[PDB]
Amino acid sequence: PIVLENGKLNINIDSKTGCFSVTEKTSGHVWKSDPWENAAGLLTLTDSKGKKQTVNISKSKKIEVSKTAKNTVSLKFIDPVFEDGSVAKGVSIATELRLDPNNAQLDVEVTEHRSGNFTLYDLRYPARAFSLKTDEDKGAAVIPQKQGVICPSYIFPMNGGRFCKWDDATYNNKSQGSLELFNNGTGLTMPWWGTYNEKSAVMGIVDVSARPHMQYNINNNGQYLFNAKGVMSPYQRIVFLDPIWKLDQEKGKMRISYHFIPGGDYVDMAKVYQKEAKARGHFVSLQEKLKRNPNVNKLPGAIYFGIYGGYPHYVNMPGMAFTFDELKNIIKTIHDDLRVDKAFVHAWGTFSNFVPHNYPISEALGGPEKLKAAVDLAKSYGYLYSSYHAYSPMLENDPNFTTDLMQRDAEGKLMNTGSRWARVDPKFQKGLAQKNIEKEISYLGLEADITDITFAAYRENGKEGRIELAKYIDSFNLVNGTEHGQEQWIPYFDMFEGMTYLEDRPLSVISHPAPLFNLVYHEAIANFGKIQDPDNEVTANGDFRIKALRSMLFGRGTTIFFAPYEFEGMRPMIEMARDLVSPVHKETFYSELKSHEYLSADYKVQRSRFSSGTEVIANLGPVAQKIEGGISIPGYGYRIQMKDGSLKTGHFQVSLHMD
Amino acid sequence: PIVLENGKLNINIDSKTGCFSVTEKTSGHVWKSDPWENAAGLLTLTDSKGKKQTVNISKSKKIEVSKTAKNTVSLKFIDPVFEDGSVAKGVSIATELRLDPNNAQLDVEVTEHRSGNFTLYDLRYPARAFSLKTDEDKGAAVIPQKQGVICPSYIFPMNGGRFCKWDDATYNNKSQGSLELFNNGTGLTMPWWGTYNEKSAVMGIVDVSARPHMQYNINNNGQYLFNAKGVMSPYQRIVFLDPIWKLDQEKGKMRISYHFIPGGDYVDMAKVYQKEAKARGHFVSLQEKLKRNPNVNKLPGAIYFGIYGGYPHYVNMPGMAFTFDELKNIIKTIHDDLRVDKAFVHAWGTFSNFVPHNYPISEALGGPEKLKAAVDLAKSYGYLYSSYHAYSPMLENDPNFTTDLMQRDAEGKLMNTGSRWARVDPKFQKGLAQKNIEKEISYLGLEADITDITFAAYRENGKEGRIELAKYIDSFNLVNGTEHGQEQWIPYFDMFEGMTYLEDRPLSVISHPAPLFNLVYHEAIANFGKIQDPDNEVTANGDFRIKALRSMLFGRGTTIFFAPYEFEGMRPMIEMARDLVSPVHKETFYSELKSHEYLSADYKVQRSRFSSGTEVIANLGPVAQKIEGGISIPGYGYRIQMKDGSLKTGHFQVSLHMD
Ligand SMILES: O[C@H]1[C@@H]2CNC[C@H]1OC2
Ligand SMILES: O[C@H]1[C@@H]2CNC[C@H]1OC2
Ligand SMILES: [Cl-]
Ligand SMILES: [Cl-]
Ligand code: NA
Ligand code: NA
Ligand code: NA
Ligand code: NA
């Protein structure tokens, strides 16, 4: 065996297979190679008859493993072998393992691939590495899926219904699959993932130039590999996360940097990526943003209100659209009746054309002067205000619809025919914003802006146009926000609407929400609930009780998103948000989320600590549970230590009034 | 154009295409043929090169339409033409349209298909028929997806977040697809579906011998047909539901009977099917079941308690398993402290072997005598009791695991390797129940039984074994329930645990729950909430507020499903169910659900009328809303007229307790 070693790690590379193990020398923990098939990597390629096949590259005809430098091992897998015994003659995969001379860091890189007469698709490399043994390791996979989740590597007590779904999912296809980087759907918002047990943690950070997918396997024994054969899997239940290098598409550097943390968990992983986040330029603190714009301080303790008038989906829809007089009266009631001290008022439906033509201010809704009166009222309260804006849609029901503003692919076919909200080519969108945004800022005297859709993902295609638009909006120095966000956009915005959780999502029945994104970026970007899943709606992600408590634990602001006719039904939740969440949001707004912990066996009792000196303990389940010292946290209850040392305790109650 | 006609319907058939329209003469509404491509049918078949393709059979080389009897039109489609212009020589499809002499019923049947050298797969016939024009017809598709849903054919006011998800789904792939009949997953529980507008309704009943799939299209303009071509759809947004005849599989009669109802909606459709359900033998009323077994009357007003001890998933799991003394104390507390007058206690975890070996009563949990003390206490209260039973699983973690009792297919491959709870061939399952169920009945003096899994679906494979097991269980004459159920199993059981809603399901963001199954079968089978989505858990289907109100509107009983450690947190929901749901469930239990109505434009206020003289009005949304007479229904509120003349009014309230 070839050995790479420094003061902290020993890398044992098998010269016959290319598989490697990593010994973390201070804990003695040994991270293993693929426990199922001893595969260094899993390559998907076409065979001589053209059918896609997936092969173990450790079964290649020739495997070369040599130490080409002091801390570098080069590997070459030559002529993989198909299941029928034929050979992909002329296919080769070259990789490298590079141990940092000093730190507990191992770089793994696919350096070259040769495809011969075959076509190469996916490469899982390293394959099924750094795994946890289910119900032996007591730890978790760590996945920054949107705000982030952990997946425990063992079965634990929980509500009986949740338990049945959890355990069942670890045995069927719900616990295996892949996710992508930097989308607003089911995918990841940070280019890292990892695993930990009680002894140590490992995480891999993907090179800034690459876009692998992430394969997950959450306590599954690989039965999915044998269902088509109709045999029972002979493998052990394990947790693993693998990079999927898309050899057919990838033109970046196929490198992942593994960091090994003794005694670490998801918090320590986030802090390690935080250092890389700063080096990549994503991290621009809220304090720097506040120095540039003092109106940023209208955000701490503010409730985000979206008054949804059926727009952009429809123009002046009956029964949903608000007039500007009705808009003004809602703002007045929020301030005078509901005593909301700080607010971001977001009015969806102020223009008489469909987006992307965000103008003129609608005469049918009352006209420019009536909208200005509503905005002037909000500004007299110290509220932030923005209308709904979007420069990316191209809607079938718009009379101005045209494919001329749409993008076409290499075949000349229209792109995003099935995604109406992102049909305009980003290279056109600054020009669209330029048509009226400066007129609206000037006329209404705007201090804030929120822009929809365009910055919800970070894809390569069109990024230059999106950066152009981001720079244009940011040049106005308004307190600005955007839908969902991604880390690459943090320098340009003050708040993200979203960066929480999809309602329907892979892993939902076998994961726990964890504030991975905010553990990295809470100092640099404020987030609020997503408008489709706001704190006033009851969804897979909870009711107001659960969402308010998770808000304080994770460091996000309250979102109240409603059609005008619902307003009277919103008052009780606006009041509870004002009383409970807003003061904590205010105190913690600029701080670092230093730590998050799970404090109960069922993961429902959690504790967050912010660098403001604020501590939030909350219990997101129905039954009172005790923590260290025998302190009891009531069901749907909280125990909050404020910066001045005062202690807030309480709980939500659902009751039935009968006349 | 060939015409079939009686006093109630005019059927207009086009001689060139085979498309037909139906004029419903009482209202004058005309059901048009395929508004998109003038396709009588859509046939999926392989071409001369073996590529699957889908063709418009109205483009066939020869189409023959002849009136072959007084009320029969025969159609033949000969030699379909592919996209390239090649002919499928030797392929033909023969159909018939048969108008009933007196009634507004039209039978449509695929009588014959010939493949030649090609292979035929799916036939949509009739294609895109009985459609609604989006935002023109105000009405809905009607789909018995589990308990049932309707899908409005027009946009309407609703919560802003819901509105965005709803409308977006009508423009992407969430609003098109297919469902299957008689599964416990995403599919249909009754073999019919329909569409209605403000003038007229049509519904189709699938022949008892057939198993088509159901294609749905909910306000989609067919963009999914064009995304791969990268062009915009030229078609209108419409709602349709189509049969998908599986020509490669179907051995039954490929017939669907359409019934036409002037002024009808989903209630009328359900009552039409209720007649057919009695003809099919499914309908055995709860009153006859009570005549056979007086203890059935322990069910009305009973809360279904599932005490989930981590079993069947694990044997004596630490932190989840209950002892029999602990079980007895939970029962005592439910009765003496929580004052629950009627209950079905279901104890998950009483045996020391894994299912399918439901024995012996566990010594580790306390032994048979202590279990008997728990059951005797429950019986002294008048409660029903059952242990958890299952005869279908074969679990990887069972020391007794063997493939001996699993089914194999013609190639010798194990079946259900991907579905651990349903692996024992049903032909063995009665034998497995015979091992101990009679010993448990006589030792514990059981009055009740619940059996898991085996009756959650109705597939052809193994149904004879399942009937054998159901007949055996029914021969004991216990008050008996089963998981989920299907209409074919109603004769053998008193209650179904489930028959409500999956949490994540196709159409969830573009449909409203409707009590379609209970509109048919409430007099014949009692149902309770599903254990994975019980009334004490907050999910996509609501919190306790929403679920308790829906329970009374739909006519189902409360389900409280909890791990033992959660019990103290269940107290407030048990009390609220006891005071609000239980008296209404008790009164309406044996009755017909005569009618259901949506009374608000957002469909959140609803009214159900039961033949016991009970009227339930409830508001499943947060804001108070007015109905006829200016009566106001509070948010999460109810107005219930009882048989004894009392009017129950009230509402749920969430309150924040800050100490
Ligand atoms: O997990 C599921 C499975 C089937 N029925 C409900 C639960 O129990 C076994
Ligand atoms: O429906 C969605 C779409 C994108 N942003 C949120 C909502 O508004 C437009
Ligand atoms: Cl959150
Ligand atoms: Cl229900
Ligand atoms: Na999957
Ligand atoms: Na800004
Ligand atoms: Na779909
Ligand atoms: Na019975």
mmCIF file of C-alpha atoms in Angstrom, chain A residues 231-378:
data_model
loop_
_atom_site.group_PDB
_atom_site.id
_atom_site.type_symbol
_atom_site.label_atom_id
_atom_site.label_comp_id
_atom_site.label_asym_id
_atom_site.label_seq_id
_atom_site.Cartn_x
_atom_site.Cartn_y
_atom_site.Cartn_z
ATOM 1 C CA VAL A 231 -32.424 -10.495 -5.237
ATOM 2 C CA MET A 232 -31.937 -9.218 -1.687
ATOM 3 C CA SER A 233 -29.051 -6.837 -1.155
ATOM 4 C CA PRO A 234 -26.096 -8.434 0.675
ATOM 5 C CA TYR A 235 -24.738 -5.031 1.751
ATOM 6 C CA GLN A 236 -24.841 -3.180 5.073
ATOM 7 C CA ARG A 237 -26.966 -0.113 5.772
ATOM 8 C CA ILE A 238 -24.662 2.932 5.514
ATOM 9 C CA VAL A 239 -24.719 6.708 5.031
ATOM 10 C CA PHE A 240 -22.615 8.194 2.256
ATOM 11 C CA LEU A 241 -22.461 11.286 0.042
ATOM 12 C CA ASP A 242 -20.527 11.165 -3.256
ATOM 13 C CA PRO A 243 -19.441 13.746 -5.830
ATOM 14 C CA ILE A 244 -20.879 12.968 -9.268
ATOM 15 C CA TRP A 245 -18.514 14.426 -11.855
ATOM 16 C CA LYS A 246 -20.454 14.989 -15.098
ATOM 17 C CA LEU A 247 -17.658 14.054 -17.479
ATOM 18 C CA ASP A 248 -19.861 14.836 -20.498
ATOM 19 C CA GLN A 249 -20.394 18.443 -19.317
ATOM 20 C CA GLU A 250 -17.676 19.473 -16.864
ATOM 21 C CA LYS A 251 -15.028 21.939 -18.053
ATOM 22 C CA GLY A 252 -13.881 23.108 -14.615
ATOM 23 C CA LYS A 253 -11.291 21.604 -12.308
ATOM 24 C CA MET A 254 -12.733 18.378 -10.886
ATOM 25 C CA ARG A 255 -11.292 18.834 -7.396
ATOM 26 C CA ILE A 256 -12.887 18.360 -3.983
ATOM 27 C CA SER A 257 -11.020 19.410 -0.819
ATOM 28 C CA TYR A 258 -11.718 17.212 2.188
ATOM 29 C CA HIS A 259 -11.283 18.744 5.656
ATOM 30 C CA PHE A 260 -11.049 16.469 8.702
ATOM 31 C CA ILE A 261 -12.274 17.865 12.028
ATOM 32 C CA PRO A 262 -11.664 15.932 15.273
ATOM 33 C CA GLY A 263 -14.808 15.926 17.386
ATOM 34 C CA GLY A 264 -16.541 18.143 14.811
ATOM 35 C CA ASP A 265 -20.155 18.249 13.656
ATOM 36 C CA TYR A 266 -22.229 20.335 11.248
ATOM 37 C CA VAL A 267 -21.397 23.569 13.117
ATOM 38 C CA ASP A 268 -17.645 23.087 12.706
ATOM 39 C CA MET A 269 -18.172 22.196 9.051
ATOM 40 C CA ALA A 270 -20.060 25.439 8.477
ATOM 41 C CA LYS A 271 -17.307 27.457 10.147
ATOM 42 C CA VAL A 272 -14.661 25.808 7.976
ATOM 43 C CA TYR A 273 -16.619 26.648 4.837
ATOM 44 C CA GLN A 274 -17.155 30.159 6.231
ATOM 45 C CA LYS A 275 -13.418 30.804 5.827
ATOM 46 C CA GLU A 276 -13.581 29.639 2.208
ATOM 47 C CA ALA A 277 -16.747 31.711 1.678
ATOM 48 C CA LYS A 278 -14.787 34.834 2.660
ATOM 49 C CA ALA A 279 -11.866 33.883 0.391
ATOM 50 C CA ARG A 280 -14.272 33.462 -2.558
ATOM 51 C CA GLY A 281 -15.640 36.973 -2.048
ATOM 52 C CA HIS A 282 -19.236 36.023 -1.175
ATOM 53 C CA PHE A 283 -19.044 37.389 2.371
ATOM 54 C CA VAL A 284 -19.971 41.070 2.627
ATOM 55 C CA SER A 285 -21.109 41.731 6.177
ATOM 56 C CA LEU A 286 -24.341 43.462 7.125
ATOM 57 C CA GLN A 287 -22.233 45.928 9.127
ATOM 58 C CA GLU A 288 -20.409 46.992 5.958
ATOM 59 C CA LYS A 289 -23.784 47.230 4.213
ATOM 60 C CA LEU A 290 -25.101 49.319 7.107
ATOM 61 C CA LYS A 291 -22.129 51.691 6.892
ATOM 62 C CA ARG A 292 -22.934 52.190 3.205
ATOM 63 C CA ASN A 293 -26.699 52.577 3.817
ATOM 64 C CA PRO A 294 -28.017 53.526 7.274
ATOM 65 C CA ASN A 295 -31.524 52.499 6.144
ATOM 66 C CA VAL A 296 -30.348 48.904 6.565
ATOM 67 C CA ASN A 297 -31.204 49.450 10.224
ATOM 68 C CA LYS A 298 -34.912 49.513 9.311
ATOM 69 C CA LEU A 299 -34.610 45.705 8.860
ATOM 70 C CA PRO A 300 -33.768 44.440 12.407
ATOM 71 C CA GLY A 301 -37.034 43.499 14.087
ATOM 72 C CA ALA A 302 -39.072 44.151 10.933
ATOM 73 C CA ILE A 303 -41.865 41.862 9.797
ATOM 74 C CA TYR A 304 -41.821 41.233 6.053
ATOM 75 C CA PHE A 305 -45.344 41.794 4.659
ATOM 76 C CA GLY A 306 -46.245 40.695 1.154
ATOM 77 C CA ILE A 307 -49.649 42.052 0.149
ATOM 78 C CA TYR A 308 -50.472 39.745 -2.731
ATOM 79 C CA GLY A 309 -52.901 41.251 -5.220
ATOM 80 C CA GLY A 310 -52.857 38.504 -7.839
ATOM 81 C CA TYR A 311 -49.894 40.134 -9.663
ATOM 82 C CA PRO A 312 -47.570 39.315 -11.495
ATOM 83 C CA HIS A 313 -49.784 36.360 -12.380
ATOM 84 C CA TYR A 314 -52.711 38.608 -13.391
ATOM 85 C CA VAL A 315 -53.357 42.302 -13.957
ATOM 86 C CA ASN A 316 -56.077 43.702 -11.667
ATOM 87 C CA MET A 317 -57.585 40.313 -10.863
ATOM 88 C CA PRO A 318 -61.081 40.670 -9.318
ATOM 89 C CA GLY A 319 -61.195 39.510 -5.725
ATOM 90 C CA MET A 320 -57.404 39.650 -5.301
ATOM 91 C CA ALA A 321 -56.111 43.013 -6.528
ATOM 92 C CA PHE A 322 -55.897 45.825 -3.982
ATOM 93 C CA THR A 323 -56.443 49.477 -4.708
ATOM 94 C CA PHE A 324 -53.823 51.923 -3.507
ATOM 95 C CA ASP A 325 -56.306 53.302 -0.984
ATOM 96 C CA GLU A 326 -56.732 49.760 0.351
ATOM 97 C CA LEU A 327 -52.952 49.341 0.391
ATOM 98 C CA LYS A 328 -52.627 52.535 2.434
ATOM 99 C CA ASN A 329 -55.302 51.421 4.903
ATOM 100 C CA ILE A 330 -53.544 48.069 5.426
ATOM 101 C CA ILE A 331 -50.266 49.880 6.190
ATOM 102 C CA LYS A 332 -52.044 52.197 8.640
ATOM 103 C CA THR A 333 -53.705 49.287 10.463
ATOM 104 C CA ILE A 334 -50.394 47.386 10.757
ATOM 105 C CA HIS A 335 -48.819 50.433 12.407
ATOM 106 C CA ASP A 336 -51.671 51.996 14.406
ATOM 107 C CA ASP A 337 -53.805 48.955 15.370
ATOM 108 C CA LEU A 338 -51.204 46.176 15.433
ATOM 109 C CA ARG A 339 -48.391 48.375 16.837
ATOM 110 C CA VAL A 340 -45.802 46.976 14.434
ATOM 111 C CA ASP A 341 -42.743 49.141 14.937
ATOM 112 C CA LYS A 342 -40.704 48.055 11.899
ATOM 113 C CA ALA A 343 -41.875 46.527 8.642
ATOM 114 C CA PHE A 344 -40.901 45.786 5.056
ATOM 115 C CA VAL A 345 -44.078 46.370 3.040
ATOM 116 C CA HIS A 346 -43.989 44.540 -0.302
ATOM 117 C CA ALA A 347 -46.945 45.334 -2.599
ATOM 118 C CA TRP A 348 -47.581 42.735 -5.325
ATOM 119 C CA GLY A 349 -49.623 44.541 -7.955
ATOM 120 C CA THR A 350 -48.909 48.188 -8.701
ATOM 121 C CA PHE A 351 -48.546 48.230 -12.507
ATOM 122 C CA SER A 352 -51.064 47.912 -15.342
ATOM 123 C CA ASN A 353 -48.739 45.950 -17.639
ATOM 124 C CA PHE A 354 -47.387 42.461 -17.106
ATOM 125 C CA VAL A 355 -43.783 42.035 -16.061
ATOM 126 C CA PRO A 356 -41.172 42.361 -17.494
ATOM 127 C CA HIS A 357 -42.696 45.808 -18.270
ATOM 128 C CA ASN A 358 -42.960 47.115 -14.705
ATOM 129 C CA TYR A 359 -44.992 50.222 -15.558
ATOM 130 C CA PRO A 360 -46.984 52.387 -15.519
ATOM 131 C CA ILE A 361 -48.342 52.743 -12.013
ATOM 132 C CA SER A 362 -51.863 51.438 -12.541
ATOM 133 C CA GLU A 363 -54.576 54.013 -13.125
ATOM 134 C CA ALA A 364 -57.255 51.407 -12.393
ATOM 135 C CA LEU A 365 -55.805 50.881 -8.906
ATOM 136 C CA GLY A 366 -55.913 54.636 -8.179
ATOM 137 C CA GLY A 367 -52.930 56.073 -10.032
ATOM 138 C CA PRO A 368 -49.463 57.380 -9.144
ATOM 139 C CA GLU A 369 -50.591 59.927 -6.534
ATOM 140 C CA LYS A 370 -52.591 57.356 -4.554
ATOM 141 C CA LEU A 371 -49.658 54.928 -4.574
ATOM 142 C CA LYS A 372 -47.320 57.728 -3.493
ATOM 143 C CA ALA A 373 -49.670 58.515 -0.594
ATOM 144 C CA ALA A 374 -49.493 54.883 0.550
ATOM 145 C CA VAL A 375 -45.682 54.887 0.231
ATOM 146 C CA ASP A 376 -45.383 58.239 2.033
ATOM 147 C CA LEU A 377 -47.443 56.832 4.910
ATOM 148 C CA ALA A 378 -45.083 53.844 5.222
#
